[PDB]
Design a protein around this ligand. Structure first.
Ligand code: XAX
Ligand SMILES: O=C(O)c1ccccc1O
Lengths: 67, 67
C-alpha cells in the first residue's frame, strides 16, 4: 500500500494563464472556444458542463468544435 | 416616370463550397457573400440544426454591390 502527492500547476509561472472565447448566436445556440485541446481526457465535455451550469441553460445549447 | 431595373454583373458570380464534417451536423462553408450571418442561419434552418454547428468563411468577393 502506497500513497501519492502531486503538485498542481506549471512550474514555469507564466504558463498558468488561459483564454476563452464565447459566441451566442441569435438562435440562443452558444459556441465556446478555449485554448485547451481534446486528447481523450474529456476536457471539452467538462467545459460544456461548466458553461451549462454557469449560464443556467441545457448542455444541448452549447457546443465546442475545435481549438 | 419609369425606371428600369439593373443586373449586378459582379464579375465573379455566386459561389459556395460546403464541407460536411460528419460529426453532429457540423458544416464549414466558403462563400462569396456579404452576409455570412444570414448564410449561417439559413443553412442551419434548412438542416434543422443549431446555428453553432455551421461555420461560414469569407475571404473576398469579385464584386457584390448588394447582390
Ligand atoms: N469594388 C467594389 N466596390 C463596392 C462594392 C463592390 O461589390 N465592389 N459594393 C458597393 C456597396 S453596394 Mo450595398 O448597401 O450591400 S446595395 S453598400 C456598398 C459598399 C459597402 O462597402 P463599405 O463602403 O460599407 O465598406 O461598397 C460599395 N463599393
Ligand atoms: O511544471 C510542469 O508540470 C510543466 C509541465 C509542462 C511544461 C512546462 C512545465 O513547467
Amino acid at each position: 500500500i502506497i500513497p501519492t502527492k502531486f503538485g498542481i500547476s506549471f512550474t514555469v509561472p507564466f504558463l498558468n494563464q488561459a483564454g476563452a472565447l464565447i459566441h451566442v448566436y441569435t438562435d440562443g445556440s452558444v459556441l465556446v472556444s478555449h485554448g485547451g485541446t481534446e486528447m481523450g481526457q474529456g476536457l471539452h465535455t467538462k467545459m460544456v458542463q461548466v458553461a451549462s451550469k454557469a449560464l443556467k441553460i441545457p448542455i444541448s445549447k452549447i457546443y465546442i468544435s475545435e481549438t | 416616370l419609369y425606371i428600369g431595373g439593373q443586373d449586378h454583373f459582379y464579375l465573379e458570380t455566386h459561389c459556395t463550397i460546403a464541407i460536411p464534417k460528419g460529426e453532429e451536423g457540423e458544416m464549414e462553408l466558403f462563400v462569396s457573400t456579404q452576409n455570412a450571418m444570414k448564410t449561417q442561419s439559413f443553412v442551419a434552418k434548412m438542416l434543422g440544426v443549431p446555428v453553432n454547428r455551421i461555420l461560414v468563411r469569407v475571404k473576398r468577393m469579385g464584386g457584390g454591390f448588394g447582390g
